[PDB]
Amino acid sequence: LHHAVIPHGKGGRSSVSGIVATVFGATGFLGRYVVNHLGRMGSQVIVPHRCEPYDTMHLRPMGDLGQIIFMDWNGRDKDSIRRAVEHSSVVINLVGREWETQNFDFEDVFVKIPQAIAQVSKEAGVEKFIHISHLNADIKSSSKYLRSKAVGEKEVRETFPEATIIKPAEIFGREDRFLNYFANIRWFGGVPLISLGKKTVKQPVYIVDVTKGIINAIKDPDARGKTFAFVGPSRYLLFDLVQYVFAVAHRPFLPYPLPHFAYRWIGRLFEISPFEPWTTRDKVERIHTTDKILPHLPGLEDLGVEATPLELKAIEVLRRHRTYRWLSDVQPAKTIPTS
Amino acid sequence: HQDLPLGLMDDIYEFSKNFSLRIDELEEMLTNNRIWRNRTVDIGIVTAEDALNYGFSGVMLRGSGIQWDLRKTQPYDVYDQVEFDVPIGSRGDCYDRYLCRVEEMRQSIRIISQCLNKMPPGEIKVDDAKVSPPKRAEMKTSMESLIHHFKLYT
Amino acid sequence: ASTSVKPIFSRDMNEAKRRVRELYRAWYREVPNTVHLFQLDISVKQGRDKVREMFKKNAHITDPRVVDLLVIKGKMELEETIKVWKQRTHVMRFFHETEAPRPKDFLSKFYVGHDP
Amino acid sequence: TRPTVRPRNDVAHKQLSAFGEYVAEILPKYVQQVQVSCFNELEICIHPDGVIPVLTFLRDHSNAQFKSLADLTAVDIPTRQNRFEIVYNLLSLRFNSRIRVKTYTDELTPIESSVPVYKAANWYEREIWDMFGVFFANHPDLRRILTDYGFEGHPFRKDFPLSGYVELRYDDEVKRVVAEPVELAQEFRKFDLNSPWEAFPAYRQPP
Amino acid sequence: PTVKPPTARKFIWTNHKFNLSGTPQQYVPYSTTRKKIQEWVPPSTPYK
Amino acid sequence: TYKYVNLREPSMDMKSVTDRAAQTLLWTELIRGLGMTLSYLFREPATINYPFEKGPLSPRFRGEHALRRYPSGEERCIACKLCEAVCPAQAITIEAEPRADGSRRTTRYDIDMTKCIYCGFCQEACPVDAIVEGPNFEFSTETHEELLYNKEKLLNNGDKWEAEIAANIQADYLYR
Amino acid sequence: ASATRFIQWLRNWASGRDLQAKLQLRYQEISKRTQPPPKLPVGPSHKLSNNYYCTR
Amino acid sequence: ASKVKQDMPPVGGYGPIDYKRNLPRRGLSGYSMFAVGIGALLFGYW
Amino acid sequence: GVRTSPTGEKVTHTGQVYDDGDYRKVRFVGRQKEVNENFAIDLIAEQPVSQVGSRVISCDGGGGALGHPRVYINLDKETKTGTCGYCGLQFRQQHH
Amino acid sequence: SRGEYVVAKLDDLINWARRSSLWPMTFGLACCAVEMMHMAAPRYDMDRFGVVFRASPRQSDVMIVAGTLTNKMAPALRKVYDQMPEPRYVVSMGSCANGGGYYHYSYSVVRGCDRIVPVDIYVPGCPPTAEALLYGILQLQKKIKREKRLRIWYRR
Ligand SMILES: NC(=O)C1=CN([C@@H]2O[C@H](COP(=O)(O)OP(=O)(O)OC[C@H]3O[C@@H](n4cnc5c(N)ncnc54)[C@H](OP(=O)(O)O)[C@@H]3O)[C@@H](O)[C@H]2O)C=CC1
Ligand code: SF4
Ligand code: SF4
Ligand code: SF4
Ligand SMILES: [Zn+2]
């Protein structure tokens, strides 16, 4: 590397960080924060987008003049992928979807597309590669979402050997579908939960921690070929977590039990709409899948990030669900000890 | 900066000719309209002593009856060679100030007519190249003019 | 003599520190409802830490005229917050949330830039 | 009369010169220096303790009647021990004449507020405080008037940078407008325009 | 122009263009200067 | 001299009082205001059919910038940086060096059309009429970046509007 | 100025004045947009003698 | 060798320009207006 | 007179072109590189050398007030042509 | 014959409605607001294109930032932008709202409204002529005319 784009400045908006990053799937929940932190330091962020340009406008104020470059691409058009990665030094793959469409399904977005990005990046000459997977990824799970990520996770590690795979748990934030999803059950009266929300342990992680971890992995060369797992600082029962969410939102809470087979059936009629499904058969599985406890995988603390307690920043997400402007404290959710 | 282009003072005359009727139509809609009067009469009354002590100037003084205009008391340019009247209010409220401005729009047409009829010939910027830049024709043939053009713009 | 100077409010430090303490009291009692009225996302604990931290920085002062101005400015700052002239953005400009940490050790500065 | 030279007014110069001595003799306790410029503007330089006695005198005295505060501004001259210079511009409708009254202060020394003399000075003194940092005693309401809430510093002081210290942008992570240290895509280009050759020998200073 | 036609020059565009904003023909800025500092290129021959 | 605007005292005779009473009850002066708006309904509107009709301009108009050439193809700019030094907004950046043939010419000439105040001082200070502001005023963009002109963009503007820039200078160079 | 005499009567009557002699639209009384070239005067200092700068 | 030519008023100046207020006096008197108003009512009542 | 580089990018009249491993070529993906094709160094070299009978000639660029400041060029050096510093037009002396 | 064709004409209808009924909310801040009013004056008459002179934030489809944005005003601009129902566009008018302008190096001016809100059209000038803004408003219309919201939805 005789060029080695050299950082300049104090790390501000007009500075140069030397990072030329292509961020696929930059138009979603996780992309907003990743692109924001890159442009907040002076990175050249290429944002290949499939949606309408009107939906990329929130990404324009995130960088200085000319530091955010927008391109068109198709997940099945390798030529378009190459155009957006050939001039870069790090590729970030944040592509995903909670549901399956006629054109695209879980295999296409979690296996066929991520592999193409890695294969094109490898020959294009990209030295770094960040791939996001799920904490509960295995090829022996009811969820087809989680089954596909395990299949697609290994292809990235076999197509781009040095890639850095990050396996976050459920992420919560302002635009998340995890804590907002819980608070939006109120449109149907009670809150269905397999069992009574018991027998499920989850370790939610803050969106910014996932973002800072992704950014740190783009800097320290002790993450090439590694595999991380971003998990929160506390483990909660699903029943406790949902009750806490409704406590912050300050709304009636009437949980009732529901059989697993019955939950899927209502989860199939809610995935008939041709728009954003309110819930799906796959989405119900992931809510109740206890988060793994992989202790052999390095986590956030190794990359220099300190996991953010949910109690610290749960009001931030659930404020808008409160029906009163001010509302005049909620006791912390019962957390499973470390033992 | 530059002299007036040929055929401008004719257009100003054509415009100034019809502008009195335009103000008349403005007064047909507001001066004697009872809704306008009730929203501007006895509103914002200022005394002549408070107006002076609060730093007011212009119509904010003349509205309250103070007879003061810097064009007639401290003239500049050629304002002492033109004829015009200074409208003065009596009540000191919004309505009287609205009348002064309307009358000032008339007295301004009065001054423009005199300016068009008394415009003298000659240069339009001081003939002193150490203050005002020389003409481009001189700047491209005279060494001194080019030196002063260079310095006055750097 | 030349050292003679016109006071602002307080003629000596002991009378100047009374104004400082009165100003810490009003600030200490305004954080609770400043975090409520503005709908901030910071606990009242770290709110009073920020008030405490600001005062401590101007603790080496030993000139009553300097201290009187620091008190005068502080009450101007307090009035803006009490009367909600400040927006949520102004109140959170003390905490520097979006400024990345800048390590102060020599080696860290050596790798990043030329600044001392 | 040369067409490119401003004509003199010797009548005004003599009149304002006489009125300067008149004010100096009636207020020896405060008037430190009186000047009349070549374009006939009288400047009365006073001790800072004499803001109210002199402004009140010029406003009320039957031969002065300066009943209009045209402007009130400060000038920052760092070389001076008292770096600030408070300038009061007064107008007289009765006598159709103007006067200027100048005093001085520094960062830590209060100057008496003239709101009791001229109500116009209410906002002028807030601007001087906000932009220069001069504190005015007994002011009905002293605050920042022109600068952003919480702005730290006094922009019009000569040692304050042109582009400031902080700049604003919207941050999506916190969903609010945030302030960060100033960085400029193009630095302001400082021009050294002064010519090394003297231009006005009449204003030459001693060696 | 059918009465007082413009002067003809070699470099004047024969074909006019409209506002090309939003199209692939838009104007993308760049620096028109060359690199200022030339780095040292180490020898490709080993030693010892 | 001065004139009172509102010093008239209303008449207090029977006819005058009954005129104001009739005005109050019968709304006469309000009807007088309805007639004026009715008049405007039957006048010709002053609206021009944009973009098929354009508002009148003059040869002095200060619009988009351009870099000119002599009647030879050679650039008029000789990198004197007088325009750079007078730009009130500091919207010009110039770098120069001897050309291959030894001619004093620029290697960079950037105008930041977002700092520019469209004031005309650059074309007043140019001793060779190199930089001018043309009549074009319709060059709105969808991105901020493409309003940061470099030498190539300005030269293209000159080669694109020269037929019109030359005629305007011809119609106004005897004033300037 | 193309309004028929009937509409002209109506607008004139309603306003209360002759609107046809003071139209707010310009037709042909405006100066031609092409004018003969000028030849501007020169200032008082354009002399070849008795014109030393220190005297002005 | 033509003479000076700058924008000047035509020899003799421009025609007079009106500026004073010209609000006309139009309508009937207060007496007549009430007469027509009362006349309408009586005919209407009839 | 462009001299397109091996990577297919036009070289402007100032010699500016992006190297292979330069990340700033990405800005031209989906767009174009604005380059003015009329090089002033090629067009002024194809202007005939004027022949004059005087050792000194004056150039004002043509047009008088519309040209450039009037300069006087010397022509006593036979080994080279006299060049104008503003416009580049060249002048030679007939025989002496 | 194809769902792409049917979903495309139905997309033109919504584009045509949104392009032909733009209701701006002018943020008159500085001198450029004067040239924005001249766009509503009789000569140009923005109202004839379906562009109403003035509307409230919740009834507005486009924000026109006409004038200088200061550090003390920036928080208010974003608040009104957030409260604007979607779809919402921004037109940046004048040098001050584009890159700071004459006041670029000031300590109290935001160097461009694009640091605060996304910008769809930039109108250059100081001030842009009332006709130059109307060109910018008519250029925003062709942007909406070129949107493919329903096309892109049909191919997800
Ligand atoms: N957010 C969460 O809760 C969790 C996220 N993850 C992982 O993070 C990644 C997604 O994060 P998140 O932001 O929440 O997802 P989002 O639903 O918010 O957005 C998904 C992104 O991927 C793009 N996308 C989806 N399908 C396609 C397609 N065929 N072609 C091109 N782009 C497509 C979308 O583009 P567009 O919409 O514009 O068409 C969008 O930019 C995934 O890898 C996921 O496994 C892991 C743990 C928790
Ligand atoms: S018009 Fe004025 S502000 Fe714009 S580039 Fe020229 S000198 Fe600078
Ligand atoms: S454009 Fe004109 S003023 Fe500017 S550097 Fe070139 S020759 Fe000099
Ligand atoms: S761009 Fe020009 S007209 Fe607009 S606000 Fe700024 S200085 Fe005023
Ligand atoms: Zn030449």
mmCIF file of N, CA, C and O in Angstrom, chain D residues 32-68:
data_model
loop_
_atom_site.group_PDB
_atom_site.id
_atom_site.type_symbol
_atom_site.label_atom_id
_atom_site.label_comp_id
_atom_site.label_asym_id
_atom_site.label_seq_id
_atom_site.Cartn_x
_atom_site.Cartn_y
_atom_site.Cartn_z
ATOM 1 N N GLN D 32 -11.853 65.279 30.552
ATOM 2 C CA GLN D 32 -10.413 65.069 30.484
ATOM 3 C C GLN D 32 -9.780 65.635 29.226
ATOM 4 O O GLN D 32 -8.595 65.977 29.244
ATOM 5 N N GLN D 33 -10.535 65.738 28.135
ATOM 6 C CA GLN D 33 -9.993 66.186 26.862
ATOM 7 C C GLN D 33 -11.147 66.460 25.912
ATOM 8 O O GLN D 33 -12.149 65.746 25.932
ATOM 9 N N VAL D 34 -10.997 67.493 25.088
ATOM 10 C CA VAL D 34 -12.015 67.893 24.125
ATOM 11 C C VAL D 34 -11.353 68.074 22.768
ATOM 12 O O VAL D 34 -10.322 68.745 22.661
ATOM 13 N N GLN D 35 -11.950 67.485 21.736
ATOM 14 C CA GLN D 35 -11.420 67.527 20.383
ATOM 15 C C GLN D 35 -12.513 67.937 19.413
ATOM 16 O O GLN D 35 -13.693 67.649 19.625
ATOM 17 N N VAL D 36 -12.107 68.609 18.341
ATOM 18 C CA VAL D 36 -12.981 68.903 17.214
ATOM 19 C C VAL D 36 -12.257 68.445 15.957
ATOM 20 O O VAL D 36 -11.197 68.982 15.617
ATOM 21 N N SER D 37 -12.828 67.464 15.266
ATOM 22 C CA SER D 37 -12.159 66.877 14.119
ATOM 23 C C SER D 37 -12.238 67.814 12.916
ATOM 24 O O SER D 37 -12.998 68.785 12.894
ATOM 25 N N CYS D 38 -11.434 67.506 11.898
ATOM 26 C CA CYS D 38 -11.361 68.371 10.727
ATOM 27 C C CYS D 38 -12.692 68.460 9.992
ATOM 28 O O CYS D 38 -12.884 69.387 9.201
ATOM 29 N N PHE D 39 -13.613 67.528 10.235
ATOM 30 C CA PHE D 39 -14.949 67.575 9.652
ATOM 31 C C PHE D 39 -16.004 68.000 10.671
ATOM 32 O O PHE D 39 -17.185 67.680 10.512
ATOM 33 N N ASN D 40 -15.596 68.725 11.714
ATOM 34 C CA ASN D 40 -16.512 69.417 12.618
ATOM 35 C C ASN D 40 -17.398 68.446 13.399
ATOM 36 O O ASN D 40 -18.626 68.486 13.327
ATOM 37 N N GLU D 41 -16.751 67.563 14.156
ATOM 38 C CA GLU D 41 -17.436 66.720 15.128
ATOM 39 C C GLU D 41 -16.757 66.885 16.477
ATOM 40 O O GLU D 41 -15.554 66.640 16.603
ATOM 41 N N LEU D 42 -17.529 67.289 17.481
ATOM 42 C CA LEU D 42 -17.012 67.525 18.820
ATOM 43 C C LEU D 42 -17.042 66.230 19.619
ATOM 44 O O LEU D 42 -18.082 65.574 19.708
ATOM 45 N N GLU D 43 -15.899 65.865 20.189
ATOM 46 C CA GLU D 43 -15.782 64.694 21.044
ATOM 47 C C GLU D 43 -15.335 65.140 22.427
ATOM 48 O O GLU D 43 -14.310 65.813 22.564
ATOM 49 N N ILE D 44 -16.109 64.771 23.442
ATOM 50 C CA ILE D 44 -15.812 65.087 24.834
ATOM 51 C C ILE D 44 -15.367 63.800 25.510
ATOM 52 O O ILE D 44 -16.130 62.830 25.579
ATOM 53 N N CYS D 45 -14.136 63.785 26.007
ATOM 54 C CA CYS D 45 -13.576 62.625 26.685
ATOM 55 C C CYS D 45 -13.691 62.834 28.189
ATOM 56 O O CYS D 45 -13.203 63.838 28.718
ATOM 57 N N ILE D 46 -14.320 61.881 28.879
ATOM 58 C CA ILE D 46 -14.674 62.040 30.281
ATOM 59 C C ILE D 46 -14.143 60.865 31.088
ATOM 60 O O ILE D 46 -13.821 59.803 30.553
ATOM 61 N N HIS D 47 -14.055 61.076 32.398
ATOM 62 C CA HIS D 47 -13.759 59.994 33.321
ATOM 63 C C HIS D 47 -14.962 59.058 33.410
ATOM 64 O O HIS D 47 -16.108 59.506 33.336
ATOM 65 N N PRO D 48 -14.738 57.750 33.571
ATOM 66 C CA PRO D 48 -15.886 56.832 33.636
ATOM 67 C C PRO D 48 -16.849 57.140 34.767
ATOM 68 O O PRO D 48 -18.029 56.786 34.673
ATOM 69 N N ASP D 49 -16.386 57.784 35.837
ATOM 70 C CA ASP D 49 -17.273 58.158 36.931
ATOM 71 C C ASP D 49 -18.248 59.262 36.549
ATOM 72 O O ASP D 49 -19.183 59.523 37.312
ATOM 73 N N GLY D 50 -18.057 59.910 35.403
ATOM 74 C CA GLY D 50 -18.864 61.054 35.035
ATOM 75 C C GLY D 50 -19.863 60.788 33.930
ATOM 76 O O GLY D 50 -20.281 61.719 33.238
ATOM 77 N N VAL D 51 -20.257 59.528 33.744
ATOM 78 C CA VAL D 51 -21.218 59.205 32.694
ATOM 79 C C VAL D 51 -22.556 59.882 32.967
ATOM 80 O O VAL D 51 -23.170 60.462 32.065
ATOM 81 N N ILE D 52 -23.031 59.817 34.207
ATOM 82 C CA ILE D 52 -24.356 60.336 34.543
ATOM 83 C C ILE D 52 -24.306 61.853 34.693
ATOM 84 O O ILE D 52 -25.189 62.544 34.167
ATOM 85 N N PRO D 53 -23.319 62.423 35.392
ATOM 86 C CA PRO D 53 -23.269 63.891 35.489
ATOM 87 C C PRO D 53 -23.192 64.599 34.147
ATOM 88 O O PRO D 53 -23.785 65.673 33.988
ATOM 89 N N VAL D 54 -22.475 64.040 33.177
ATOM 90 C CA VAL D 54 -22.262 64.716 31.902
ATOM 91 C C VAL D 54 -23.405 64.448 30.934
ATOM 92 O O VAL D 54 -23.900 65.365 30.276
ATOM 93 N N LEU D 55 -23.842 63.194 30.826
ATOM 94 C CA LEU D 55 -24.993 62.894 29.982
ATOM 95 C C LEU D 55 -26.241 63.596 30.496
ATOM 96 O O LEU D 55 -27.028 64.137 29.711
ATOM 97 N N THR D 56 -26.443 63.593 31.814
ATOM 98 C CA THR D 56 -27.577 64.308 32.390
ATOM 99 C C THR D 56 -27.468 65.804 32.135
ATOM 100 O O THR D 56 -28.470 66.472 31.866
ATOM 101 N N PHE D 57 -26.256 66.351 32.230
ATOM 102 C CA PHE D 57 -26.065 67.773 31.974
ATOM 103 C C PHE D 57 -26.367 68.118 30.522
ATOM 104 O O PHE D 57 -27.138 69.042 30.240
ATOM 105 N N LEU D 58 -25.771 67.382 29.583
ATOM 106 C CA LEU D 58 -25.967 67.691 28.171
ATOM 107 C C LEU D 58 -27.424 67.532 27.758
ATOM 108 O O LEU D 58 -27.889 68.226 26.849
ATOM 109 N N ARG D 59 -28.160 66.634 28.413
ATOM 110 C CA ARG D 59 -29.558 66.415 28.062
ATOM 111 C C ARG D 59 -30.461 67.520 28.602
ATOM 112 O O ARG D 59 -31.441 67.893 27.951
ATOM 113 N N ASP D 60 -30.150 68.056 29.782
ATOM 114 C CA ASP D 60 -31.028 69.008 30.451
ATOM 115 C C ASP D 60 -30.607 70.458 30.288
ATOM 116 O O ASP D 60 -31.476 71.330 30.211
ATOM 117 N N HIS D 61 -29.311 70.745 30.249
ATOM 118 C CA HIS D 61 -28.870 72.132 30.255
ATOM 119 C C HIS D 61 -29.493 72.891 29.092
ATOM 120 O O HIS D 61 -29.548 72.399 27.963
ATOM 121 N N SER D 62 -29.962 74.107 29.378
ATOM 122 C CA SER D 62 -30.745 74.855 28.401
ATOM 123 C C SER D 62 -29.945 75.168 27.144
ATOM 124 O O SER D 62 -30.526 75.299 26.061
ATOM 125 N N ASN D 63 -28.628 75.295 27.258
ATOM 126 C CA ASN D 63 -27.785 75.558 26.103
ATOM 127 C C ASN D 63 -27.277 74.291 25.426
ATOM 128 O O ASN D 63 -26.558 74.394 24.428
ATOM 129 N N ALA D 64 -27.625 73.105 25.928
ATOM 130 C CA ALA D 64 -27.193 71.854 25.319
ATOM 131 C C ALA D 64 -28.356 71.061 24.737
ATOM 132 O O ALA D 64 -28.378 70.791 23.534
ATOM 133 N N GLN D 65 -29.333 70.697 25.560
ATOM 134 C CA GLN D 65 -30.544 69.996 25.130
ATOM 135 C C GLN D 65 -30.238 68.895 24.115
ATOM 136 O O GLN D 65 -30.692 68.921 22.971
ATOM 137 N N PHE D 66 -29.457 67.908 24.556
ATOM 138 C CA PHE D 66 -29.171 66.727 23.739
ATOM 139 C C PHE D 66 -30.145 65.627 24.146
ATOM 140 O O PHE D 66 -29.825 64.710 24.903
ATOM 141 N N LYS D 67 -31.359 65.721 23.609
ATOM 142 C CA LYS D 67 -32.491 64.900 24.035
ATOM 143 C C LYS D 67 -32.726 63.713 23.113
ATOM 144 O O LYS D 67 -33.869 63.313 22.888
ATOM 145 N N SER D 68 -31.668 63.125 22.565
ATOM 146 C CA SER D 68 -31.822 61.966 21.692
ATOM 147 C C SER D 68 -30.503 61.215 21.662
ATOM 148 O O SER D 68 -29.484 61.776 21.249
#
